[PDB]
Write a protein that binds this ligand. Structure first.
Ligand code: HEM
Ligand code: HEM
Ligand SMILES: Cc1cc(N)nc(CCCCCO[C@H]2CNC[C@H]2Cc2cc(C)cc(N)n2)c1
Ligand SMILES: Cc1cc(N)nc(CCCCCO[C@H]2CNC[C@H]2Cc2cc(C)cc(N)n2)c1
Ligand SMILES: C[C@H](O)[C@H](O)[C@H]1CNc2nc(N)[nH]c(=O)c2N1
Ligand SMILES: C[C@H](O)[C@H](O)[C@H]1CNc2nc(N)[nH]c(=O)c2N1
Ligand SMILES: [Cl-]
Ligand SMILES: [Cl-]
Lengths: 362, 362
């Protein structure tokens, strides 16, 4: 059934992909070659055109993503040729550099060799390529609590964090055949960070907040035509609310709202004063202002939602069904001020797509 | 099958209701009487205890409602005895007066005779007992656009609005047997309104905003044990966001955000300034402040969510499954700052409950 699962997905993908590429006539012949290769090898190999378009379709099908308007301009890097951990590291270093692009972020995905017998060739441990470490012991919380388990795993492997609130985690990944992953410190010259200041409130810098420039998801599986690319890190630029309303604001993350309240000079004593809402707004203004000032790409949730409306319109104009997860698409701030809040979305899974997979640690 | 639908719902309801009331032993006998009455009369009649508890269960089961902690203190008024339009009017007038309670709002439901053969005895046309009229003609929008169709229906029937932005709609309802509904102007001495001022910003009063004190939903059907109470208006007190983030803020309602932006002295030119978010917050602070100052009950979304958490805890402690609609339970402002945002809810329909029904007009 597994090989049958493969061939069925291949048939569906090649048909769709080639139709979109105006290569419909070449489907019959290509499917034959694939059919044979599966019979002989137990799998098949994507052409570079299929791989690139597959990765683009996969972004297009990501129900939780508000930024899908730009699916067709995804920059795809084909690293199916890597065999060594040095090559994997260098490819990850390169992805960070080219995606960052001096602040003018390029949505990029780097694609590593796919699973074979469900057997990974490269197993990435990071959730994102750039993220801050987290610590908890003896009442003291330091850094990003969402990073606590990975951080402790890294520190098993001989890495030691400086225990600032913003330690950059090393890259950590395991090669097929090795029992233990390896880790490499990120070159700081590769990592753009943005200090959070406020356009009007000078004391905001007293909070000494910052965030990294580029979110590069490295823990999802890209599935294209029955082929499982478990190692395929991808990035966009941030929507401000991800940083201001969640990473910095959540009680189980950096939990900064009371401190924000204090520096903007409002009491944090009464629910009816809406101090949390006010703090959220100013913190989010600060995030957008700070990124813009440093020349690092970012989008506000209003512009993003307007782009998403265009994505919806394009979909219908092209005759593609639109799928979406309403619960993730709405921004965590002023959701009812976007059109997304006022309609519904079909949450069906369409492939190609990006999927969660089990962590290799804890 | 219809009578069978009735008996099945009756069996389920009486069992559950009596179990909760510690009247389990009396189920067998009561179900017999009901079984007979259905055979003979084509329906059955609730005892006052069943009716009251049914209405309370129905609130408890309302998946979209954040304010369910107080389900068991619902004030139930039994008006199954009304036969005339004067009695219906007087009962509606009374509901407004006793629910308002000089600003100290009492969650109340008044229950009118139920449908018979699916035939209504009393057909209420209002969406809420107190609501503002809406007009649209020749480019000019006046009042609440959500009221446009009902307003035009009222004006067919000989009513004429003053065409301020806050005309109180008359009560409008039809009696079984009459071809046309009747309407009655609301006595203004019965209707508490709150002028919207801001605690810090004196110019906010220049907007000349107000809202009514008590939301009294009059267009839903209460269903209890297979009995359809189509006319059963109910009220709570407002959560501020309903007024500040929707009624006054929505583009398709009062659309006040630009005016709010101007009076609080911020530009409304750039998405990245988050002026809509800031305007939303100040408008919502104003709403809470204004209601509190006038001694009219209201709750902020933070306190409401804290109460809902207690509702969740009570449910589990009492062994009842909890049902909820995540998409309605999250507040439209700072949703991720409430616990609701961070969990999921089962959206199953449990009866008794309140249901939408078709409008009698347009
Ligand atoms: C170009 C800028 C982009 C923006 C502004 C953007 C925005 C977002 C946002 C706000 C989320 C919600 C995540 C959260 O709530 O934590 C999201 C989720 C997601 N985005 Fe995008 N995105 C972008 C590019 C991309 C790219 C390039 C891909 C992949 C090729 C992608 C795939 C996804 C996926 C798979 C999710 C769901 C992740 C999960 O379930 O954990 N997005 N996006
Ligand atoms: C005591 C104060 C109450 C508060 C603060 C409250 C709060 C809310 C809120 C915020 C909503 C969402 C409505 C919207 O988004 O427009 C809602 C919906 C609802 N509430 Fe409550 N509520 C209260 C009392 C009641 C009572 C007394 C009942 C009935 C006995 C009730 C039944 C419902 C129902 C049925 C809905 C959904 C209405 C619909 O689908 O249109 N609530 N409530
Ligand atoms: C590509 C991209 C662009 C952009 N602007 N923003 C993003 C954000 C990606 C969000 C992924 C992080 O999600 C975490 C934090 N909220 C829920 C949780 C979801 C999750 C769980 C697991 C097990 C893995 C995973 N990758 N993601 C990604
Ligand atoms: C009892 C109560 C207390 C409280 N604090 N708030 C409420 C608000 C009730 C909301 C009902 C109004 O809902 C309208 C506006 N948003 C969606 C729409 C839903 C709707 C549609 C229809 C056809 C009928 C109806 N009653 N409700 C009710
Ligand atoms: C139908 C569509 O999901 C719509 O935007 C919903 C979303 N959640 C909501 N939540 C509440 N409380 N009230 C509403 O009117 C709506 N509207
Ligand atoms: C799982 C639960 O619904 C949770 O609160 C969701 C809600 N919507 C979300 N939406 C976004 N964009 N990101 C998230 O992490 C979540 N979390
Ligand atoms: Cl992030
Ligand atoms: Cl309302």
């Amino acid at each position: 059934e597994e090989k049958e699962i493969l061939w069925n997905e291949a048939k569906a993908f090649i048909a769709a992909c080639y139709q979109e590429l105006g290569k419909a006539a070449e489907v019959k012949d290509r499917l034959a070659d694939i059919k044979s290769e599966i019979d002989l090898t137990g799998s098949y190999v994507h052409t570079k055109e299929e791989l690139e378009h597959g990765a683009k379709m996969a972004w297009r099908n990501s129900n939780r993503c508000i930024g899908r308007l730009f699916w067709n301009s995804l920059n795809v890097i084909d690293r199916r040729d890597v065999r060594t951990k040095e090559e994997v590291r260098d490819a990850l270093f390169h992805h960070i550099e080219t995606a960052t692009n001096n602040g003018k972020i390029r949505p990029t995905i780097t694609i590593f060799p796919p699973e074979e017998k469900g057997e990974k060739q490269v197993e990435i441990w990071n959730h994102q390529l750039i993220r801050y470490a987290g610590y908890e012991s003896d009442g003291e919380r330091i850094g990003d609590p969402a990073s606590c388990s990975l951080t402790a795993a890294c520190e098993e492997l001989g890495w030691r964090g400086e225990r600032t609130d913003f330690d950059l985690l090393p890259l950590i990944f395991r090669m097929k055949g090795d029992e233990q992953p390896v880790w490499y410190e990120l070159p700081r010259s590769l990592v753009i960070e943005v200090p959070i200041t406020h356009p009007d409130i000078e004391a905001f810098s007293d909070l000494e907040l910052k965030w990294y420039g580029v979110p590069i998801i490295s823990d999802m599986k890209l599935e294209v035509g029955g082929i499982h690319y478990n190692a395929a890190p991808f990035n966009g630029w941030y929507m401000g609310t991800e940083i201001g309303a969640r990473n910095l604001a959540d009680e189980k993350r950096y939990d900064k709202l009371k401190k924000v309240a204090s520096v903007i000079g409002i009491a944090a004593d009464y629910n009816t004063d809406l101090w949390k809402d006010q703090a959220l707004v100013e913190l989010n203004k600060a995030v957008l202002h700070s990124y813009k000032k440093q020349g690092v790409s970012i989008v506000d949730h209003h512009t993003a939602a307007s782009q998403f409306k265009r994505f919806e319109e394009q979909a219908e104009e092209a005759g593609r069904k639109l799928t979406g997860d309403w619960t993730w698409l709405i921004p965590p701030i002023s959701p009812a001020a976007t059109h997304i809040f006022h309609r519904s979305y079909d949450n069906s899974i369409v492939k190609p797509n990006y999927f969660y997979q089990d962590k290799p640690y804890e």
